[PDB]
């Protein structure tokens, strides 16, 4: 059982994606996880957007767990560099038929009083209590507190590659990232049993946010650009 | 004990490279792997470049075992795309003091009258009878049957970039393939447990082979050209 989409664009209104918050598509073609405002970004804001359809993971009656295969394009804009841009965006897997959670450092997807499960990859911009160096890529599981990092150089208003990759025999979740214009190549990866914290249905999609109130800046904000997207995903069982 | 060195070209007579049978550096800094005389590749070529000095994977009193990360650039380029373009390059670790082993699907790290053992990360431009269509990346443990595979499309004499990074805690040996001028990325991820099969001392390097003579074929060649190459390792021990 093969599942797959891609999405060279996006149109205003697809029946395909189900736009949650602020997200929204742009004329262009541009789905804009956060607010931007005569072409200047917003803070106190948060966006996702999710596949329409879910998608089973893993299988409880083989106990056979699905491999996948995901890639997308993004742009992250940061006008106002001084004080500190905010918050960053990520692809993740959550249950069906969840609720944006959290803005700011939490990106949406984590919410405090019904917390639900997630594997999540994140593109941090802003340096919470709980993060190394900004920005950087990490792994999470069920906690913004990656389990894993590593730090990057942002192409600001550039456009960056992204390809996950996630391996059912050897439960390695991997990722790459590549900024074309500054032939710069990151890569991370770890150990991830899908089966362990996910239901066998999920959603797939992403979500953003940009500074939140409580930081008393509204300069800390930036864009978060979903330029296109193919996903691709295998459960033999 | 951290290592690294770093060539951003190669200079003939490369003190710290050991060059063997074919492989030789160009007058314009390039490193040969198989024989190309007047601007062609020729079949029935052999060659290996290695760093000179071996370098510490692994400690057995501390039982600690070395995290790497190596990236260099090559480029394979197909005169003769009719019969079949042969064999491909590799990056290996061995134990030092090897010898050039057989040519055509072996890349020349392989010796069936006294196989030694070896880790590597294969372009594999030809299909042996073991081989899955080509070409493809290949992770070797012991031998050439891959324990994983993935196809690519070859940018024929374009630049690719290629990662290879190792994390010793997670065991996961990750590697990228990008082609600038075509915008694709491959990416190949696997366990491999370096304390299990090699010696705490290795010598580093690349390995490589055209086509060979019982295959009757002249056109099964193609360069195997290394542009630059960094390598750093760090041995918590
Ligand atoms: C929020 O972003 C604004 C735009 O980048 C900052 O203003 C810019 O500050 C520059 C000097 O840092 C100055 O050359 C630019 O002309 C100015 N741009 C505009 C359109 O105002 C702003 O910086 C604060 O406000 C300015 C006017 C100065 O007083 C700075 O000293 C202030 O830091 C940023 N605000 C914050 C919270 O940093
Ligand atoms: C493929 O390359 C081999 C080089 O490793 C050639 O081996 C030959 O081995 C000889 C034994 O010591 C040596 O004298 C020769 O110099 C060398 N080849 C050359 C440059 O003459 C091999 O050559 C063929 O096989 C040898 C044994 C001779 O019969 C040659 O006349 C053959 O051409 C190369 N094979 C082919 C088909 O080109
Ligand atoms: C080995 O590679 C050669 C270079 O591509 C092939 O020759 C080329 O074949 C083309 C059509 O096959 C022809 O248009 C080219 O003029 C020719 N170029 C040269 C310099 O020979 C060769 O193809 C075969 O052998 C040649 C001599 C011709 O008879 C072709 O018709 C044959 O297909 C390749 N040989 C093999 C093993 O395929
Ligand atoms: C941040 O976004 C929320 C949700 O979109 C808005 O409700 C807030 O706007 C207004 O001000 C806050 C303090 C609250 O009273 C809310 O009910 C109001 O609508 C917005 N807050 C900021 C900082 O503009
Ligand atoms: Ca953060
Ligand atoms: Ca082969
Ligand atoms: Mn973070
Ligand atoms: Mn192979």
Do not use: C, M
């Amino acid at each position: 059982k093969t599942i797959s989409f891609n999405f060279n664009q996006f149109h205003q209104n697809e029946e395909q994606l189900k736009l949650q918050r602020d997200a929204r598509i742009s004329s262009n073609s541009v789905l804009e996880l956060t607010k931007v405002v005569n072409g200047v970004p917003t803070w106190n804001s948060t966006g996702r957007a999710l596949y329409a359809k879910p998608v089973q993971v893993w299988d409880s009656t083989t106990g056979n767990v699905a491999s996948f295969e995901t890639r997308f394009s993004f742009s992250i804009r940061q006008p106002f560099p001084r004080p500190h841009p905010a918050d960053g965006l990520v692809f993740f897997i959550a249950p069906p038929n969840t609720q944006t959670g959290e803005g700011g450092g939490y990106f949406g997807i984590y919410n405090p009083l019904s917390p639900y499960p997630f594997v999540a990859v994140e593109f941090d911009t802003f340096r919470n209590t709980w993060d190394p160096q900004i920005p950087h890529i990490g792994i999470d599981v069920n906690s913004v507190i990656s389990t894993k990092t590593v730090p990057f150089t942002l192409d600001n208003g550039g456009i960056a590659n992204v390809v996950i990759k996630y391996d059912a025999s050897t439960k390695i979740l991997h990722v790459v990232l590549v900024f074309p214009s500054l032939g710069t190549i990151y890569t991370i990866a770890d150990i991830v049993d899908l089966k362990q914290v996910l239901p066998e249905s999920v959603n797939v999609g992403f979500s953003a946010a940009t500074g939140d109130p409580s930081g008393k800046q509204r300069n800390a904000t930036e864009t978060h650009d979903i330029l296109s997207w193919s996903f691709s995903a295998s459960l033999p069982g």
